[PDB]
Design a protein around this ligand. Structure first.
Ligand code: HEM
Ligand SMILES: C=Cc1ccccc1
Length: 455
């Protein structure tokens, strides 16, 4: 009962490699999944993986007794600046489990109560920016959402203000972070990496690692010296001990966690807010329902933590945006031991799988025929969703540690935006999804007309 896997078109000795040599490789893989179905083999010189798209097979990929997290080539390149922080570590590295145990209490739903006031500080800066636009002016949506998420992670994470709303050119740390992510990603499509064409890329990459390390190491040192007692992510790492080994993180690994929280959280969360606003302006009845909830619930000039927990329909809007365009759209696994997937695909120890999340979230056997419609009400009875059907935050012990942070920030911000403004898709925007490590609607712009409600 061994079934042979489909495979997309090949390019002689390059196998399937040239199919990823494209501006939008995840969108290209989705089309291949539409043509080939729930599983297909993908070969490149010296490597193979199998792309999975159905809930039936991903339910089994998510079995942690059989499969563990693999570092994709993209995460191996990001590792050159994120080191052994949580997202770029293997599960078997000592620093993965130590940092996971130390940081988990700082990321819980209960922990969000202590970060709430500083998330509101940055959210009120975004609202005031928009209130202060002139009549003719419009909003660059991903750009302003990115200023917000970076500043919120910097403030809530280590008490540092990047002051992105005071700037055209970002803080030099952010410029270096973004240029290092961009070079790590560009390295995936680089035939001759030692060509002299890339000498400047190499020099600038090392310069950017140094800018990041120098700022973050200085912030850690300033804190240790001052002895200032705080309760932010940096405080928890300075003070915390892993209950298992009894050891704290060392200062180098703390620096890698801080850089990881910025890289892992900034564009995924700004992409989520950008797609959510895109889908609301494209579905005015849904926008009106979400705006009615915001006006009902957010009765004070500043939202409270409790009021954010009552934005239930806004939370469903965000889940439905994550269903259609999950902003960290794939994750990689390897077989811990020889095993058979789905009763028909034998795998050897070490074989790789790729979970293609946007295609999982379009599985009609789970969601029904209307998978392309934006309908938040499909999250009304979440106990009915089968296991492992909805995976925007990854899987198991290697799932997103920042999930509660991301969702509380996005619910708070989207709530305030709907309370304070009416929106206009003034250009009749044509969705264009730019791919980096994450997804975003490039060039999405709106006009916001103030409801003139004070802060
Ligand atoms: C909506 C926004 C977000 C999405 C969709 C998202 C998605 C994901 C996914 C899919 C993974 C698993 C990656 C893999 O298996 O290779 C992951 C891991 C991770 N994310 Fe998030 N993320 C978001 C926001 C955040 C934020 C705000 C933070 C930090 C505050 C964060 C920090 C991390 C970390 C540290 C990991 C690694 C955890 C571990 O392996 O122990 N993420 N994320
Ligand atoms: C949080 C997004 C993300 C994406 C890839 C690896 C680790 C985290």
């Amino acid at each position: 009962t061994i079934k042979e896997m489909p495979q997309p078109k090949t390019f002689g000795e390059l196998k399937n490699l040239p199919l990823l040599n494209t501006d939008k490789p995840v969108q290209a893989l989705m089309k291949i999944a539409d043509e080939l179905g729930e599983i297909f083999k993908f070969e490149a010189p010296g490597r193979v993986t199998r792309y999975l798209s159905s809930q039936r097979l991903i339910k089994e990929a998510c079995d942690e007794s059989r499969f563990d997290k693999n570092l994709s080539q993209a995460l191996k390149f990001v590792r050159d600046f994120a080191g052994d922080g949580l997202a770029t570590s293997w599960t078997h590295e000592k620093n993965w489990k130590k940092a996971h145990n130390i940081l988990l209490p700082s990321f819980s739903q209960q922990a969000m109560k202590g970060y709430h006031a500083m998330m509101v500080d940055i959210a009120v800066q975004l609202v005031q920016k928009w209130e202060r636009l002139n009549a003719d002016e419009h909003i660059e949506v991903p750009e302003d959402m990115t200023r917000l998420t970076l500043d919120t992670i910097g403030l809530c994470g280590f008490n540092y203000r990047f002051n992105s709303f005071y700037r055209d050119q970002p803080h030099p740390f952010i410029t270096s972070m973004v240029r290092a992510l961009d070079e790590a990603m560009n390295k995936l499509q680089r035939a001759n990496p030692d060509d002299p064409a890339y000498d400047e890329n190499k020099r600038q990459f090392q310069e950017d690692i140094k800018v990041m390390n120098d700022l973050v190491d200085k912030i850690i040192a300033d804190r240790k010296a001052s002895g200032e007692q705080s309760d932010d992510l940096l405080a928890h790492m300075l003070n915390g001990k892993d209950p298992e080994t009894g050891e704290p993180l060392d200062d180098e690994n703390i620096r890698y966690q801080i850089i990881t929280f910025l890289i892992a959280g900034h564009e995924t969360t700004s992409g989520l807010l950008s797609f959510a606003l895109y889908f609301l302006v494209k579905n005015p009845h849904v926008l009106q329902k979400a705006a009615e909830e915001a006006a009902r619930v957010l009765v004070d000039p500043v939202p409270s933590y409790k009021q954010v927990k009552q934005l239930k329909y806004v939370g469903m809007v965000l889940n439905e945006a994550l269903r259609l365009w999950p902003t960290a759209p794939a994750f990689s696994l390897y077989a811990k031991e020889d095993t058979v997937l789905g009763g028909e695909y034998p795998l050897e120890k070490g074989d790789e799988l790729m979970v293609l999340i946007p295609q999982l979230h379009r599985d009609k056997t789970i969601w029904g025929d209307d998978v392309e419609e934006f309908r938040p009400e499909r999250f009304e009875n979440p106990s009915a969703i089968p296991q492992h059907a909805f995976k925007p935050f990854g899987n198991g012990q290697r799932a997103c540690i920042g999930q509660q942070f991301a969702l509380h920030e996005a619910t708070l911000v989207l709530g305030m935006m709907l309370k304070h403004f009416d929106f206009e898709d003034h250009t009749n925007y044509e969705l264009d999804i730019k791919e980096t490590l994450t997804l975003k609607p490039e060039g999405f712009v709106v006009k916001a007309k103030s409801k003139k409600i004070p802060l």
